[PDB]
Every structure is written in C-alpha cells, then in structure tokens.
C-alpha cells in the first residue's frame, strides 16, 4: 500500500520508540517520535556526559554528506540545560531519506535522570515550523517539497502493550489502521497539533478547550481545577507525596472523557487510561492522568488517547484526522 512505514516499539505501556538513521553511513538511533516538539535531537560522539556514555552516538566525521553548521543551541528542560549546535546530514526515516538540519547534542545533563533511565538515544520532533528552534521546516514538509511523497501528512497507529505493534506512516492514510469514519479537526494554531474540542467528564465541562495531540506525552493532562472536580468522589486516592492517583481497576465509578466538535465525538473510557500496578496492590491501577495548567485552558491528548484513536496529522490542510484504531494488526 506504499507510503513510508516506520515500526513503533512499545516500552512498558509508558512510551514507544522508532528507529531512524543519521549520516550517509546510516548511523542507527532509537528515537522518541514527538508531535509535541519540532527539532531532531541527536547525541554526539563529542558528548561525554554520563548519559551519553550509554547511548548510540553520532560521528559527523564518518558521514560524507555532513555539512557543518555550528550554530549554538541551548534549551531549558525542567530546571536544567541541554546544549549543542546545528548540523546538517542525511536523515533516513524508513525507506526515505533527505539532508536535514538537526541539533547535535553535546550536553544532556539538563535532561537527567530521564535520559539515562530510558533506552532511547534522541528525540525526533513532528510538530510545526514555529514550534522549532531555528525555524526548521518539519521533516514531512521537506519530504513533500522534494516530491518524495504526494501529501505532507503522517499518521500514528500506536503499539499496544501485550497486543500489537505500531506504525508511524508518512505520506498517506492506510485502511489497515482504522475502522469507522475518519473525522477532521482544524488546527487552532500552526504550532502544536492543537485543536478545539468541548471537554466533558461527568458533570464537569470546559467548552472549546485547547486539546493538544501529543505522541511524546504518556498521560492525559487536564487543567488542575477540572481534575480536582472530576475526581470527587470516585474512590480514587492520591498517593501521598506523589503526583499520582490510584484506584481499584474494577472501580465502576470511574468516568469517561468526552471530547466533541461539530465534526466528531471522541471518548476515553477507564480501560484506556488505567495502568495495572499489581506489584503495589492486588487489583490496583494507576490513572494515566496528570493535572497541568497552561496559560490557556488545555488538555494534552497523549499516548492513552492515541492508543485508542488512529491519528492523521496533515500539514497541507492544517488539520488532525481521528478514527478508531483497529484493535489488532
Ligand atoms: C540527545 C537527546 C536530547 C533531547 C533534548 C530534549 C528535547 C525535548 C525535550 C522536551 O521538552 N520534551 C520531549 C520529551 C518527550 C518524551 C519524553 C519522555 C521520556 C521518557 C519517558 C518514559 C519514562 O517514564 O521514563 C521514566 C516518556 C517520555 C521526554 C521529553 C517535551 C516536549 C513537550 N511535551 C509536553 C507538552 N507541552 C505542550 C504540549 N505537550 C513533553 C515532552 C526534552 C529534552
Ligand atoms: C500519571 C503519570 C504516570 C504515567 C506514566 C508517565 C510516564 C511518562 C510521562 C511523560 O510523558 N514524561 C515526559 C514529559 C511530560 C511532560 C513534560 C512537561 C514539560 C513542561 C511542562 C511545563 C508546562 O506547563 O508547559 C509549558 C509540563 C510538563 C515533560 C516531559 C515524563 C518522563 C519521566 N519524567 C520523570 C522521570 N522519571 C525518571 C526520570 N525522569 C517525568 C515526565 C507521563 C506519564
């Protein structure tokens, strides 16, 4: 069915990764594929932090297609800095390749201990140009410009732990991934893949909420006050001194998220946002939900949402398409 298909590997129902190469010698890396960011971040052989010592590292000297840039990049994570500089080289994603401007990372310390604790080497952003450092056209946009695909879109069919594999597909929408109707939502900004949906959980509602479709976030995030209200009183317990909520897995009081527009209706039932934690208690689950406030009222529709719904990210039409993901592949 053509298109460029990059297989996705689940890690513990907490993240997924895909592989891609840098350099015309095809130096291999494992990446977070993140619609919530917009640069390609690749750890350098010149990075000698503790974290880098555990990773696959990029050596520009070994690629004939390396084009030096050297423009310095500094990014703040939560309370630390990540630094490096721009480089241009051949980036291979699936069966497609192109010269591309990425950030060669020298200091990863601001991303600790997350970086060392995880098995990925880098992060490949899939957001919009304006979200990027350095105003870099997204990979898929650049592929289209070069007539390597006919449509500047990509799709996510997420892997499901203990059930099936997943795919990032560039260039077209394949029937094998979804069932029922695909419905489209226009972007409210060309920044994140952010759309406007009415959010309702039980009797709590936020009309025309900003909803960010975000493959790099493993939870659903909800405004803090909204979350407080929806969680009363459901036999859910905040874990003392931790930002986590736990509950019995068969808890019949647990609500379903409802997100609606004039174009479609999307729901997220407890089975999709509950994570079994049998090791901490028989029949106990954690809620894959985090309270988070943004300057405008925002939900992040992260991996729990994307596991249920196949998603289409269309640069040409400035829209997100959503359909029920096929249960098996
Ligand atoms: C050599 C590699 C250098 C990489 C440098 C770098 C670049 C970008 C970020 C960043 O900030 N991100 C991207 C990000 C994406 C995913 C993760 C991540 C990491 C690990 C795990 C699994 C885990 O639980 O480990 C304990 C799950 C997710 C971490 C960060 C965030 C982008 C914004 N979203 C949240 C968001 N905000 C608005 C919309 N969505 C969260 C991830 C962090 C570091
Ligand atoms: C209900 C929660 C339990 C479900 C499991 C789970 C696992 C991983 C995650 C996850 O997407 N990340 C990546 C991430 C998610 C969100 C952010 C983020 C970044 C910035 C902001 C600030 C803001 O408000 O935006 C402007 C708010 C949030 C940054 C990174 C996490 C990666 C791991 N680190 C913690 C860690 N453990 C070990 C090392 N680091 C936290 C973020 C979320 C949930």
Curated annotation (Swiss-Prot):
One of its GO terms (molecular function) is aspartic-type endopeptidase activity. Disulfide bonds join 47-52, 249-285. The keyword Lipid metabolism does not apply. Inhibited by pepstatin A. The gene is PMII. Not N-glycosylated. Proteolytically cleaved into the soluble active mature form in the digestive vacuole by cysteine protease falcipains; the process begins at the early ring stage. Proteolysis requires an acidic environment. In absence of falcipains, autoprocessing may serve as an alternate activation system. Its EC number is 3.4.23.39. Residues 16-323 form the Peptidase A1 domain. This is Plasmepsin II. It comes from Plasmodium falciparum (isolate HB3). Residues 1-329 are lumenal. Component of the hemozoin formation complex (HFC) composed of falcipains FP2A and/or FP2B, plasmepsins PMII, PMIII/HAP and PMIV, heme detoxifying protein HDP and falcilysin FLN. The HFC complex is involved in hemoglobin degradation and detoxification of heme in the food vacuole during the asexual blood stage.
């Amino acid at each position: 069915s053509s298109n460029d298909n990059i297989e996705l590997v689940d890690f513990q129902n907490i993240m997924f990764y895909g592989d891609a190469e840098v350099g015309d010698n095809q130096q291999p890396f494992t990446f977070i594929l993140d619609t919530g960011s917009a640069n390609l971040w690749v750890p350098s052989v010149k990075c000698t932090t503790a974290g880098c010592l555990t990773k696959h590292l990029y050596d520009s000297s070994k690629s004939r297609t390396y084009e030096k840039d050297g423009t310095k990049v500094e990014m703040n994570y939560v309370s630390g800095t990540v630094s490096g500089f721009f480089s241009k080289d051949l980036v291979t994603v699936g069966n497609l390749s192109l010269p591309y401007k990425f950030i060669e990372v020298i200091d990863t310390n601001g991303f600790e201990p997350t970086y060392t604790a995880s098995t990925f080497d880098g992060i490949l952003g899939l957001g919009w140009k304006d979200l990027s450092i350095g105003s870099v056209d997204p990979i898929v946009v650049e592929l289209k410009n070069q007539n390597k695909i006919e449509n500047a879109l990509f799709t996510f069919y997420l892997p499901v732990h203990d059930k099936h594999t997943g795919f990032l597909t560039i260039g077209g929408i394949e029937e094998r991934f979804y069932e029922g109707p695909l419905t489209y939502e226009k972007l409210n900004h060309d920044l994140y893949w952010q759309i406007t949906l009415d959010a309702h959980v039980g009797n709590i509602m936020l009309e025309k909420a900003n909803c960010i479709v975000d493959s790099g976030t493993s939870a659903i995030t909800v405004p803090t006050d909204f979350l407080n209200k929806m969680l009363q009183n459901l036999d859910v317990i905040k874990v003392p001194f931790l930002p986590f909520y736990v509950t019995l897995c068969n808890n019949s009081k647990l609500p379903t998220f409802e997100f609606t527009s004039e174009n479609g209706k999307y729901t997220l039932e407890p089975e999709y946002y509950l994570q079994h934690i049998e090791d901490v208690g028989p029949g106990l689950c954690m809620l894959n939900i985090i309270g988070l406030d943004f300057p405008v009222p925002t939900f992040i529709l992260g991996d729990p949402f994307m596991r249920k719904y196949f998603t289409v990210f269309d640069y040409d039409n400035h829209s997100v398409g959503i359909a029920l993901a096929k249960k098996n592949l």
